[PDB]
DNA sequence: ATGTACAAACACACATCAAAGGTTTATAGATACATTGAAACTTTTATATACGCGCCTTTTTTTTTT
C-alpha cells in the first residue's frame, strides 16, 4: 500500500489488481492496511491516470486516448456513477472510443490484456449505445 | 738381546638429543534440526448496502452405432 501511497501520491495511480500482480496481498490484507496508511499521513498532516495507460497497452494512437478523456470525463461529469470501482467504466470509453474508430480491438481481445469482465462492457456500453448523443467534438 | 700383553693419550666411530612434522581427536565452533509455549492468527452473521464469479442449477445445442 506504501506502494500505491506512494504511486498515488507520486500523481501515479494503479488498479489495486496491478499491484496485487506484483504482491498477492490476498486482496483483503491490502485494504484494511491501507485504510490506516491514509489517515496515518491525515494524522501526520483519481481515476484519470487508467484512461492513457490502457491506451499503450493496446498499442493505440492518440486520437483514440485524447477523446476519451474528453468522454470519460463527460460521461462522468453529468450522471452515471456506474461503476463500482471505475476502472471498468474507464475502460468503456476506449470501447466507447475504439468502436468511433474502426480498429479491431474485439471485446475478448480487450478483456485478457487488460484483465477485465466482458459482462461490465456490455452493460456498461448499454449506457453508452444510448448516450451516444453529447460526446461529439468534431 | 727383546720384543710382548697391558693400559694411559687422541682423535675419532657410535649411540643420543632434539627440531620438525604427518596423523587423531577431543574439543570446541558452528549447525541443523527438535520443543514448546506463546501470541499472532483464523470464524458467525446479517445486514443491509452494490459488486462478480463460479458454481447450483438448468435449457438448447451437440454428437456414435444398428
Known amino acids: 500500500a506504501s506502494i500505491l501511497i506512494g504511486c498515488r501520491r507520486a500523481e501515479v495511480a494503479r488498479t489495486f489488481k496491478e499491484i496485487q500482480s506484483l504482491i498477492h496481498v490476498k486482496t483483503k490484507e491490502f485494504g484494511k492496511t491501507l485504510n490506516i496508511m491514509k489517515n496515518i499521513l491525515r494524522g501526520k498532516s483519481q481515476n484519470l491516470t487508467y484512461i492513457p495507460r490502457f491506451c499503450s497497452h493496446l498499442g493505440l494512437p492518440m486520437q483514440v486516448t485524447t ?9 462522468k461529469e453529468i450522471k452515471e456513477i456506474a461503476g463500482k470501482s471505475p476502472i471498468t467504466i474507464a475502460v468503456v470509453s476506449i470501447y466507447l472510443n475504439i468502436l468511433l474508430f474502426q480498429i479491431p480491438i474485439t471485446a475478448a481481445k480487450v478483456g485478457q490484456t487488460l484483465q477485465v ?5 456490455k452493460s456498461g456500453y448499454k449506457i453508452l449505445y444510448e448516450h451516444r448523443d453529447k460526446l461529439v467534438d468534431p
Open 67 to 75: 477523446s476519451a478523456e474528453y468522454t470519460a470525463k463527460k460521461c
Open 117 to 121: 469482465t466482458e459482462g461490465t462492457i
